[PDB]
Design a protein around this ligand. Structure first.
Ligand SMILES: [Mg+2]
Ligand SMILES: [Mg+2]
Ligand SMILES: [Mg+2]
Ligand SMILES: [Mg+2]
Ligand SMILES: [Mg+2]
Ligand SMILES: [Mg+2]
Ligand SMILES: [Mg+2]
Ligand SMILES: [Mg+2]
Ligand SMILES: [Mg+2]
Ligand SMILES: [Mg+2]
Ligand SMILES: [Mg+2]
Ligand SMILES: [Mg+2]
Ligand SMILES: [Mg+2]
Ligand SMILES: [Mg+2]
Ligand SMILES: [Mg+2]
Ligand SMILES: [Mg+2]
Ligand SMILES: [Mg+2]
Ligand SMILES: [Mg+2]
Ligand SMILES: [Mg+2]
Ligand SMILES: [Mg+2]
Ligand SMILES: [Mg+2]
Lengths: 203, 143, 177, 262
RNA sequence: UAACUUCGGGAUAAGGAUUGGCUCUAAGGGCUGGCAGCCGACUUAGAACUGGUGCGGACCAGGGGAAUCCGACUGUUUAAU
RNA sequence: UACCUGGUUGAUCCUGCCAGUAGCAUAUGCUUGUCUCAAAGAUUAAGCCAUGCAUGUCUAAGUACGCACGGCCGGUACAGUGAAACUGCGAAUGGCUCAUUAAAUCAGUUAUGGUUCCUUUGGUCGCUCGUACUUGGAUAACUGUGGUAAUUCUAGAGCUAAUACAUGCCGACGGGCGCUGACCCCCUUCGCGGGGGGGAUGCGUGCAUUUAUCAGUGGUGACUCUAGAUAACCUCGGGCCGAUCGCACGCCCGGCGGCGACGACCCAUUCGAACGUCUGCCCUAUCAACUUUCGAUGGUAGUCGCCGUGCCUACCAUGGUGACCACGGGUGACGGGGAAUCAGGGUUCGAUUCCGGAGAGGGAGCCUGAGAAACGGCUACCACAUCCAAGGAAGGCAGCAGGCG
C-alpha cells in the first residue's frame, strides 16, 4: 500500500532508479488520523513489534501547562485559530502538533484565586468566590499570602485573555499517534508573535 | 530579524518566560578537541542542525574538503579529491567526489575555495549527512 | 449452501468470512476465505428448513414430545454444581457430584465421576501460601541490601572526605612553606 | 532473510571448535544465552568432542537430561547451551570440575580445577548503570546484573563472584601493572602484564602488554580481561602459562620431548 | 505535437483532460506620518461542499489524415452561363 | 622448463598473418579387466505438469465423566494408560533456482548519542495507602437430526471444561511523605508587629505513558543521557501489580511450611533485523548535456512510520549532476570468498554445495504473528489448466522422484 521508501525516487544526479525488490512490510505507511474536535474517540493500531499506537480521531479535552507558574490543569479545547503549516488545516478544525488553539480560562482562574487571593479578569461576586477571597484568615498564614502578593502580577497580554474567558495554547504532543492533546499556554514574546499573525491574517 | 518564518523560532530547551518583577541560549561542545566558535555563543541565530547549538551529535568519520558552491541556504557543497591506484599499470588516477554539507551560520565568513573539516552525523536530509566543524582559509585570501 | 443470519437478501452471495463467523472453520490462524452462502429470507429454492419449537401446543406429538432424552453430561465446575442443587458455601460438593453409571457387556458394572474443577483444596491453599511467602522474602531482601549498601557507601564516601582534606591540608602546607 | 536463522553449517562454524568436514552438513547452532555465538562453546561440543564421554548427539542428550551437568552452579538441560570464557563446568557425579580458559592458541582447553576454585569465577564488567531509585547496577561480560556494588568499581574492572550467592567478593581495578588475558583478536590466549593505555577519542583504545618473556604485543581494549594483581593470577592458569611459543622452537620442544620419551 | 522543409514554417498538426453553483484562502497597489493609519481597483492560482455526469448548457464557434497533377506565393480576369 | 616449426620468392632478408603445439571445460565417436573418491536438466524454456511424498508437536507438571482399555478399597471429585478436540508453540528455518538487478546488489570499514527484537541468561515482580477457602457464561470434543453430484464444505438441536474468553478483592497497611490548614502553645515587643514550635480535617501519595517546569547520583570524546524534585495526565479499540499446575509431605497452636512448572510489565543480554558512512564494477558517444510546480536540490512547520530523512503534505528559495565520462542504452550481468591458464606482468570464467540478495506462472492487495507484503497462507485481475448432474467446486514441483517439451 503506502510506502515510506527511498528506492522509488530519483538519485542525486537525477537518474531513474530501477527497483530490485518489491514492496516490503516494514516500509509501510498508514492513513492520516486527522484529529477533529469533538466527543472523544480513539482507535488503537497494532504496530511493528506488537506495540500499540492510539489514533485520536475526535478529541475535546487535554491538559496544558502554565509555565510561568507551573500549573498544569486539564482543560477543554475550544477552537483552532492558527496553524503554521497549512491554512486549510484551520478552516477545518484539526489538531496536529504545534497548532495554536483556544482553551478555557476556568481551571487556571480557579488556581490563581486560591493561590494568590487576587481577582484576575473579572470586569457581582458570587458567594463561593467572595468567601475564598475574604475568608476568616489567621495572621500566621495572612503574611504567607501577603508575601505571595509580590509576584502575583501577571503579563498584561494574558490579562485581557483571562477576562475574555479563553487562552491561547500550543499543542506539543502528537495527537495522531499518542492519543493526547497535551501542550502549554502561550506567553511572552511567543504570544505577541502569534497575536500579530492572527490579527494580520484577518485583515 | 530572526522570526522570519511562519512558526515561532526558538531553541527547544530554553524556557524564555520566567517571571521578572538577554535570552540565555543553549550550546554545547561537540568533543574530539573541536573548539566551539565564539559567535555560536554570543550569536542570536537558531538552528536545529547546527552542531554547537542543535540536537545533532558528531560520530563516525571526520573528513575534509574544499568549498565549491554556496548557493543553497544553510548548506554548501564541498569537493573531495583523491587518487585511485590501478594495479595493471602501477599508476594512479585522479578521482573526485563532491558532497552536500550543512553549514551552520556561525561559520559566517566562508568563501569559495577554502578547506573545511566535516564530521559525520545523523542523516539531516536526502543527501546531507555531514556538518562543518571548522573552516581554514585558503592560501593568501586574507585581504 | 447454508443460510446465515444478517445477509438479508434473496439468493446466494459470496462473502469473505473469518474467525468467529458462521459456516466457516478456519485452518490456519488469521486465515480468511470467500464462500457462497444463501440469503437470510426463505423462499421456495432450498432443501431443508431448520425449525425449532419454542412453545408447545395442547396435544402430544408422537415423534418429538413422547420420547425424552436426558442431558448426557453433568456439571463439572464446582460453582455450577452448587447452582444445580442450591448448596451453600460450607457444605462440600464432593458429596453431591453426579456420578455416571457404566454398564456394558463382558465387564464389571462400575460408576464414573468427573474431576471437579475450581475446587478449594488443601493443595491450592499451599500454593497461595507460597505466593505470599515469596513476597515476604522479596521485600526482606530489598531492605537488607539497601541498608548494607547504605553503610558501605558511607565508608567509601568517608575515605573520599579525608582524601580531599589531606590534599588541601598539604596544599595548605605547600602554600605555607 | 524473512526471519531469524536457526541452522549452522559446519564449514561456517567457528574454527576453534575444531569441527571436521565429512561427519555432517550441519553444526550445532549455540542457543541464545549469555555468550556470543562466535566466542562460546556449546555443551554438545564439550562432552562429545573434547571429553569424549559420548559418541553421538543422542548419547550426550541422555547425559545432560539426567541432570548430571551443572554449569556455573546451575543445572542445564540444553545440549546446545553456550558456555563461554571463565564458566565453571561441574559434573558432580564423576567428581570433576572444569573452567573454560583459552590455551596458548585460539582454543578452549580442558582445565581441571579443584572444588574450592570451582566455587567462584571472575568476570569483566561492561556497564555502570543507575536503577530506578538511585540503585546502582553493573553488567558483567556474561550478562549478569547485580545491584548495590562497591562504588569503586568502574567500567573495565573485573570482579570475583561467588557462584552460590552471585555477589561480589573482591575486585581488580584496571590499571597498568596488573596481569591480563586476551579474550579475542590475533593474540587471544596470551598472558602478560599491562604496560600502557593509549586512548583514541571516538575510536577504540589500544592496550600494550608484554608477557613473561619480554615479547610485547598490543590489542584493542575490548579484548582485555584482567586476571590478577601484579603478576599473580587469581585463577589457576593452564599449561604453557599463556606464553605463545613460535613455530621455530615449538618443533624444537616437540621432538626433544619425543626423543626424551623415546 | 510527426513526415518534410527554402530552417522562416508545417501548427489550432495529429491526440488527450478540464469547464456549473456556492463558501472560502493566497498573491498581485496608492496616499499620509523593514512601522502605523486610511484607502482602494480589478485579475490569477488553490481548496471544501454540492446538483438525476450536469456545465463554452442559448448565441458565437476549424472535421481530420496519407498521396498524385498544375500554378511558387499575395494579386487580376470573361458586368448577365 | 622465461621455447617454437611449416607456408608468399628462381633464390635472399624482412613485415605479416594463416596452420601447426600444450592445457582446461561442454558435447560427441570408438573402446573399456580391478579398486578409491566423485560432478550430474545451469546454458535453449523463471516452459507446462499426471501420481505419491516433503511440518508437525505431550511432560510428574493447561483442559479426560470417549468402560477405548483398565485396579479395587469404595463412594472423600479425580487410580492409571489413553484416541479425539479445545489450548500453547512451530510452520518467517531448511530446500530449489538465477528471471530481475550496473553505486543497485555485494565486499572491506564504521555508526544507530537516530530504532524494533519471540526465545535464552541475569535482574526486577507486599515500593501503590485503595466471594478471595476461588467469581461469570459460552464453546468444541461427544450424543442426535441433516443438505449438496461433488471439497480437509458445513447447518439446526442437546450437554460439559481451561494456563481459551471475561470480571475482580482481601493482605503488606501501621503508618510515613508532600500540600492545605481550623487551632493551640511559647519567646520578644505597651501594642501593632517580629520569631519559634506542635497541630485535627481534607487532597495527593508505586512503576510504565504524555506534557510542562526546577536543580545539577553516575557516565561519555561529545546528550536534550541515567538518576532527582514539582504540577498534572493516564485512551472503554483501558498497562503491570499471579482467581493457573506437579511432586513430595512436615512443623506449630486452624495457622505456617520446601523444591519446582507455567505466565507476566520493565531494564540489560543473546540471536538478529533495518536504515545510514567511506572506497571499490563490464561494454558503448552512430548516447553530450540531464533532473524540476507528476520532488528535481535545499529551508521551516508538520503528517506517516519502529525510529533519522522530500517518506509525504503546506509555504518558500533555485537549486543538484557532467568530459575526472553525468544521463541514456546493452549485457549470452545475481555479487563475493573463489576457478583455469600461467616465467615477471596478465587474460578469461564464477548458474554451481560457503556468505549476502532476489523469486515462487505474471502483477497487485492483505490476515495472523516478535518476525511475512509468506505463496507446501488468504483476496482479486491476466494466462494456462482440472472435476461437474451445467447449478458450482478446486489450482500453482525455480522441493524429492517422475513425465511432456
Ligand atoms: Mg603491473
Ligand atoms: Mg531461506
Ligand atoms: Mg499536414
Ligand atoms: Mg512525378
Ligand atoms: Mg496561383
Ligand atoms: Mg460570367
Ligand atoms: Mg611476391
Ligand atoms: Mg615457389
Ligand atoms: Mg592457432
Ligand atoms: Mg576383487
Ligand atoms: Mg568387485
Ligand atoms: Mg542464464
Ligand atoms: Mg528450464
Ligand atoms: Mg533486460
Ligand atoms: Mg540474467
Ligand atoms: Mg554466483
Ligand atoms: Mg519472498
Ligand atoms: Mg513454472
Ligand atoms: Mg505473494
Ligand atoms: Mg510447491
Ligand atoms: Mg516456503
Amino acid at each position: 500500500g503506502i510506502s515510506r521508501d527511498n528506492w522509488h525516487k530519483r538519485r542525486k544526479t537525477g537518474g531513474k532508479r530501477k527497483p530490485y525488490h518489491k514492496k516490503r512490510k516494514y516500509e509501510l505507511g498508514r492513513p492520516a488520523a486527522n484529529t477533529k474536535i469533538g466527543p472523544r474517540r480513539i482507535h488503537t493500531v497494532r504496530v511493528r513489534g506488537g506495540n500499540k499506537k492510539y489514533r485520536a480521531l475526535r478529541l475535546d479535552v487535554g491538559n496544558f501547562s502554565w509555565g510561568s507558574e507551573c500549573c498544569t490543569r486539564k482543560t477543554r479545547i475550544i477552537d483552532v485559530v492558527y496553524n503554521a503549516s497549512n491554512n486549510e488545516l484551520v478552516r477545518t478544525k484539526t489538531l496536529v502538533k504545534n497548532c495554536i488553539v483556544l482553551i478555557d480560562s476556568t481551571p487556571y482562574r480557579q488556581w490563581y484565586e486560591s493561590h494568590y487571593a487576587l481577582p484576575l479578569g473579572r470586569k457581582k461576586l458570587t458567594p463561593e468566590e467572595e468567601e475564598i477571597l475574604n475568608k476568616k484568615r489567621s495572621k500566621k498564614i495572612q503574611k504567607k499570602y501577603d508575601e505571595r502578593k509580590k509576584n502575583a502580577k501577571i503579563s498584561s497580554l494574558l490579562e485581557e485573555q483571562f477576562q475574555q474567558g479563553k487562552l491561547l495554547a500550543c499543542i506539543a504532543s502528537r495527537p495522531g499517534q499518542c492519543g493526547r492533546a497535551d501542550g502549554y499556554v502561550l506567553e511572552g514574546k511567543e504570544l505577541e508573535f502569534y497575536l500579530r499573525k492572527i490579527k494580520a491574517r484577518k485583515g | 530579524d530572526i522570526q522570519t518564518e511562519r512558526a515561532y523560532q526558538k531553541q527547544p530547551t530554553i524556557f524564555q518566560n520566567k517571571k521578572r518583577v538577554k535570552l540565555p541560549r543553549y550550546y554545547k561542545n561537540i568533543g574530539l578537541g573541536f573548539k566551539t566558535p565564539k559567535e555560536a555563543i554570543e550569536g542570536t541565530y537558531i538552528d536545529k542542525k547546527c552542531p554547537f547549538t542543535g540536537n545533532v551529535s558528531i560520530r563516525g568519520r571526520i573528513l575534509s574538503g574544499v568549498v565549491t558552491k554556496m548557493k543553497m541556504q544553510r548548506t554548501i557543497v564541498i569537493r573531495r579529491d583523491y587518487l585511485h591506484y590501478i594495479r595493471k599499470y602501477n599508476r594512479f588516477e585522479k578521482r573526485h567526489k563532491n558532497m552536500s554539507v550543512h553549514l551552520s551560520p556561525c561559520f559566517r565568513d566562508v568563501q569559495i575555495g577554502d578547506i573545511v573539516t566535516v564530521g559525520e552525523c545523523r542523516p539531516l536530509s536526502k543527501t546531507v549527512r555531514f556538518n562543518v566543524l571548522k573552516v581554514t582559509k585558503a592560501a593568501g585570501t586574507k585581504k | 449452501f447454508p443460510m446465515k443470519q444478517g445477509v438479508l437478501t434473496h439468493g446466494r452471495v459470496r462473502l469473505l468470512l473469518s474467525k468467529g463467523h458462521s459456516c466457516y472453520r478456519p485452518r490456519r490462524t488469521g486465515e480468511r476465505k470467500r464462500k457462497s452462502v444463501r440469503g437470510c429470507i426463505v423462499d421456495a429454492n432450498l432443501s431443508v428448513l431448520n425449525l425449532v419449537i419454542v412453545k408447545k401446543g395442547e396435544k402430544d406429538i408422537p415423534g418429538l414430545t413422547d420420547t425424552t432424552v436426558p442431558r448426557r453430561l453433568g456439571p463439572k465446575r464446582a460453582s455450577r454444581i452448587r447452582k444445580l442443587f442450591n448448596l451453600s458455601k460450607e457444605d462440600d460438593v464432593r458429596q453431591y457430584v453426579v456420578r455416571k453409571p457404566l454398564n456394558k457387556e463382558g465387564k464389571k458394572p462400575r460408576t464414573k465421576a468427573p474431576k471437579i474443577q475450581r475446587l478449594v483444596t488443601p493443595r491450592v491453599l499451599q500454593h497461595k501460601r507460597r505466593r505470599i511467602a515469596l513476597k515476604k522474602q522479596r521485600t526482606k531482601k530489598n531492605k537488607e541490601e539497601a541498608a548494607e549498601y547504605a553503610k558501605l557507601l558511607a565508608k567509601r564516601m568517608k575515605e573520599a572526605k579525608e582524601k580531599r582534606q589531606e590534599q588541601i591540608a598539604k596544599r595548605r602546607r605547600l602554600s605555607s612553606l | 532473510a524473512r526471519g531469524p536463522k536457526k541452522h549452522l553449517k559446519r564449514v561456517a562454524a567457528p574454527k576453534h571448535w575444531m569441527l571436521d568436514k565429512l561427519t555432517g552438513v550441519f553444526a550445532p547452532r549455540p542457543s541464545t544465552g549469555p555468550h556470543k555465538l562466535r566466542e562460546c562453546l556449546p555443551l554438545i561440543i564439550f562432552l562429545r568432542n573434547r571429553l569424549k564421554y559420548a559418541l553421538t548427539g543422542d548419547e550426550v542428550k541422555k547425559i545432560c537430561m539426567q541432570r548430571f551437568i551443572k554449569i556455573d552452579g546451575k543445572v542445564r538441560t540444553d545440549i546446545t547451551y553456550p558456555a563461554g570464557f571463565m564458566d565453571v563446568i561441574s559434573i558432580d557425579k564423576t567428581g570433576e570440575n572444569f573452567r573454560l580458559i583459552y590455551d596458548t592458541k585460539g582454543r578452549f582447553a580442558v582445565h581441571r580445577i579443584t572444588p574450592e576454585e570451582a566455587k567462584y569465577k571472575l568476570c569483566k564488567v561492561r556497564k555502570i548503570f543507575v536503577g530506578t531509585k538511585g540503585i546502582p547496577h553493573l553488567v558483567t561480560h556474561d550478562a549478569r546484573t547485580i545491584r548495590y556494588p562497591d562504588p569503586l568499581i568502574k567500567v573495565n574492572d573485573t570482579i570475583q563472584i561467588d557462584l552460590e550467592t552471585g555477589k561480589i567478593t573482591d575486585f581488580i581495578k584496571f590499571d597498568t601493572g596488573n596481569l591480563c588475558m586476551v579474550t579475542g583478536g590475533a593474540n587471544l590466549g596470551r598472558i602478560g602484564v599491562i604496560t600502557n593505555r593509549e586512548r583514541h577519542p571516538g575510536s577504540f583504545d589500544v592496550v600494550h602488554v608484554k608477557d613473561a618473556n619480554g615479547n610485547s604485543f598490543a590489542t584493542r581494549l575490548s579484548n582485555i580481561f584482567v586476571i590478577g594483581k601484579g603478576n599473580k593470577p587469581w585463577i589457576s592458569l593452564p599449561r604453557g602459562k599463556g606464553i605463545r611459543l613460535t613455530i621455530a622452537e615449538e618443533r624444537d620442544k616437540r621432538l626433544a620431548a619425543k626423543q626424551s620419551s623415546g
